[PDB]
Scaffold this active site. Sequence first.
Site, PDB file in Angstrom:
ATOM      1  N   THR A  18       0.805  -1.217   0.000  1.00 36.91           N
ATOM      2  CA  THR A  18       0.000   0.000   0.000  1.00 36.91           C
ATOM      3  C   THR A  18       0.840   1.271   0.000  1.00 36.91           C
ATOM      4  OG1 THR A  18      -1.759  -1.153   1.222  1.00 36.91           O
ATOM      5  CG2 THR A  18      -1.832   1.254   1.188  1.00 36.91           C
ATOM      6  N   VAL A  19       0.384   2.279  -0.738  1.00 32.37           N
ATOM      7  CA  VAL A  19       1.059   3.569  -0.792  1.00 32.37           C
ATOM      8  C   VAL A  19       0.186   4.554  -0.023  1.00 32.37           C
ATOM      9  CG1 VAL A  19       2.166   5.312  -2.216  1.00 32.37           C
ATOM     10  CG2 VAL A  19       1.958   2.996  -3.064  1.00 32.37           C
ATOM     11  N   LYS A  34       5.298   3.861   1.045  1.00 35.84           N
ATOM     12  CA  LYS A  34       4.981   2.633   0.336  1.00 35.84           C
ATOM     13  C   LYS A  34       5.343   1.486   1.258  1.00 35.84           C
ATOM     14  CE  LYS A  34       5.747   0.153  -4.007  1.00 35.84           C
ATOM     15  NZ  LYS A  34       6.133   0.398  -5.431  1.00 35.84           N
ATOM     16  N   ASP A 125       6.807  -0.571 -16.872  1.00 37.96           N
ATOM     17  CA  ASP A 125       5.467  -0.407 -16.320  1.00 37.96           C
ATOM     18  C   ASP A 125       5.004   1.041 -16.425  1.00 37.96           C
ATOM     19  OD1 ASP A 125       3.090  -1.171 -15.210  1.00 37.96           O
ATOM     20  OD2 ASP A 125       3.821  -1.242 -13.135  1.00 37.96           O
TER      21      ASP A 125
HETATM   22  C1  6ZV Z   1      -7.394   6.682  -4.574  1.00 32.82           C
HETATM   23  C2  6ZV Z   1      -7.168   7.470  -5.871  1.00 32.82           C
HETATM   24  N1  6ZV Z   1      -6.902   8.907  -5.538  1.00 32.82           N
HETATM   25  C3  6ZV Z   1      -6.835   9.743  -6.781  1.00 32.82           C
HETATM   26  C4  6ZV Z   1      -5.609   9.326  -7.620  1.00 32.82           C
HETATM   27  N2  6ZV Z   1      -4.376   9.534  -6.814  1.00 32.82           N
HETATM   28  C5  6ZV Z   1      -3.173   9.257  -7.657  1.00 32.82           C
HETATM   29  C6  6ZV Z   1      -1.929   9.617  -6.903  1.00 32.82           C
HETATM   30  C7  6ZV Z   1      -0.885   8.706  -6.801  1.00 32.82           C
HETATM   31  C8  6ZV Z   1       0.261   9.040  -6.105  1.00 32.82           C
HETATM   32  C9  6ZV Z   1       0.350  10.311  -5.506  1.00 32.82           C
HETATM   33  N3  6ZV Z   1       1.525  10.653  -4.787  1.00 32.82           N
HETATM   34  C10 6ZV Z   1       2.797  10.049  -4.761  1.00 32.82           C
HETATM   35  N4  6ZV Z   1       3.810  10.943  -4.399  1.00 32.82           N
HETATM   36  C11 6ZV Z   1       5.052  10.438  -4.349  1.00 32.82           C
HETATM   37  C12 6ZV Z   1       5.331   9.076  -4.639  1.00 32.82           C
HETATM   38  F1  6ZV Z   1       6.577   8.652  -4.570  1.00 32.82           F
HETATM   39  C13 6ZV Z   1       4.254   8.235  -4.992  1.00 32.82           C
HETATM   40  C14 6ZV Z   1       4.366   6.807  -5.319  1.00 32.82           C
HETATM   41  C15 6ZV Z   1       5.530   6.084  -4.998  1.00 32.82           C
HETATM   42  C16 6ZV Z   1       5.626   4.747  -5.304  1.00 32.82           C
HETATM   43  F2  6ZV Z   1       6.717   4.062  -5.003  1.00 32.82           F
HETATM   44  C17 6ZV Z   1       4.556   4.110  -5.929  1.00 32.82           C
HETATM   45  N5  6ZV Z   1       4.427   2.768  -6.333  1.00 32.82           N
HETATM   46  C18 6ZV Z   1       3.203   2.695  -6.880  1.00 32.82           C
HETATM   47  C19 6ZV Z   1       2.620   1.456  -7.445  1.00 32.82           C
HETATM   48  N6  6ZV Z   1       2.523   3.940  -6.860  1.00 32.82           N
HETATM   49  C20 6ZV Z   1       1.173   4.208  -7.367  1.00 32.82           C
HETATM   50  C21 6ZV Z   1       0.243   4.564  -6.210  1.00 32.82           C
HETATM   51  C22 6ZV Z   1       1.188   5.340  -8.404  1.00 32.82           C
HETATM   52  C23 6ZV Z   1       3.395   4.858  -6.244  1.00 32.82           C
HETATM   53  C24 6ZV Z   1       3.293   6.216  -5.937  1.00 32.82           C
HETATM   54  N7  6ZV Z   1       2.980   8.706  -5.057  1.00 32.82           N
HETATM   55  N8  6ZV Z   1      -0.661  11.229  -5.586  1.00 32.82           N
HETATM   56  C25 6ZV Z   1      -1.764  10.859  -6.279  1.00 32.82           C
HETATM   57  C26 6ZV Z   1      -4.422   8.633  -5.625  1.00 32.82           C
HETATM   58  C27 6ZV Z   1      -5.630   9.056  -4.753  1.00 32.82           C
END
Ligand code: 6ZV
Lengths: 274, 242
Positions: A18-19, A34, A125
């Site tokens: 989970t993030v 994360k 990806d």
């Molecule tokens: C529920 C939907 N609503 C509306 C859409 N909204 C999108 C969104 C997605 C991310 C952020 N912020 C953010 N900032 C810094 C980061 F480093 C990461 C980060 C790091 C990692 F390692 C990740 N690994 C994976 C698989 N992810 C995914 C989650 C993209 C990572 C993300 N994310 N702000 C908005 C979410 C809330």
Amino acid sequence: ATSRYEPVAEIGVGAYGTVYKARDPHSGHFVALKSVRGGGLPISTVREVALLRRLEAFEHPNVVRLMDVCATSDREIKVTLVFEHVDQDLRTYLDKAPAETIKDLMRQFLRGLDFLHANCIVHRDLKPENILVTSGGTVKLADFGLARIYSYQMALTPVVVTLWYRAPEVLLQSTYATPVDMWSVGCIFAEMFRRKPLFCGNSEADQLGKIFDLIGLPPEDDWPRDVSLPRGAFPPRGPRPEMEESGAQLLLEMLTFNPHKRISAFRALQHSYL
Amino acid sequence: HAPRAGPDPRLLGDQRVLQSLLRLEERYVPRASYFQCVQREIKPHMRKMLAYWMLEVCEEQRCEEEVFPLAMNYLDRYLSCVPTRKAQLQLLGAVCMLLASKLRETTPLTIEKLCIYTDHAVSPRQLRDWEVLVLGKLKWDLAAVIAHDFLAFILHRLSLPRDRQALVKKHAQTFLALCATDYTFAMYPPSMIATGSIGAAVQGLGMSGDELTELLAGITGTEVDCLRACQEQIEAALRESL
Ligand SMILES: CCN1CCN(Cc2ccc(Nc3ncc(F)c(-c4cc(F)c5nc(C)n(C(C)C)c5c4)n3)nc2)CC1
């Protein structure tokens, strides 16, 4: 003295874990967390952290910055990666209404990928969810859990990339290299104008069919040889939504069937469109 | 079903990629000789003994060629900053192989497989615990640049045809493994171990030796005299690896 970030929002869930958006209740500063879900540590976690740690030496502006990696522990150990927080992803950035921004967004997107490729890293990806944009308009590439250093003669994970952004050579179960990310870039470039995915296939074969409907069926000298499904399994199709002349030229060089003739991230940054 | 990575000309031919590796490599060179000030119980011959054990495990399991030297990179970097006792060397080395394999191999080593080669007193719990400990002490910075990473880039800059490189590559791999077993090479830049091993291999197989040394040095920005001394040390270490 120690401080603690407390989670204030879930921003994604996957098999990877989970993030979270997290906030220090005493300073108000935000990060993203994360959290990682005989045995040993998951391979994806070891790879993602190792690649980010290698890239952290450069502080490139178009890649998310890994700040810290906490492993705490009970029988089960929990690994937590700490990232500098970004406010949104590319989807959230677009449904907020210009073409001038798309060229700068595309410029930063290509700069970040060229920085990865110039560092021997393939993402594998790329998708709108993994392309983040700060409130100031800075593109940040995220999610390196599927990424690898590409080394001549190493074994490759056969199925990579989500279906709608997967390159034809991977769909045909052929070998692949850095052009796979460039195919995703083309899909993302077009999606900034369509606001809807370009190839919404129902399966791997359905994805190739939707791809061939626009790019056209490759002849025979371009069909990959290390595949089982031959070219005669697909119907003949010809080429050819509201972008520029030179932009359509750049898009077709990204969406080239043969990955060896597919444009590189560096050459795309040198395109007349940008 | 089981694809293999081909030679990407977009990578091998882009000079910035080689320049990036050359800039990164010093980051992964172990700090200083840990044998005088940091380790007390652990002696150089013990490292050579552990290295041959690690190499045998990697050979018997048919690991990719990078796994063993990468595991030795983790071992040396760990011993540079964590005083360790002789009785823990095998456990440490097993964990270094596990992490290197998990990073670089599609079908990696497992904790149960490592228990075949560790003495029976070592358990899966200890291996799980030491994986976390080693990751912490190395700051999870496992994507090190090692000598093998330069092999394809250097060979790309020789006009020797792709097929005629087959035996050169195989022979150079013997020299790369040898250097990782030998502590005298532990602080050479990986690009010098790679060019020295290639030089020793191409010479051992038989356009002259001086021109080749000149070329190999020019490829990496190394002094010619420094490359010549490293290649002679590599050749001597092989003949004396007894
Ligand atoms: C529920 C939907 N609503 C509306 C859409 N909204 C999108 C969104 C997605 C991310 C952020 N912020 C953010 N900032 C810094 C980061 F480093 C990461 C980060 C790091 C990692 F390692 C990740 N690994 C994976 C698989 N992810 C995914 C989650 C993209 C990572 C993300 N994310 N702000 C908005 C979410 C809330």
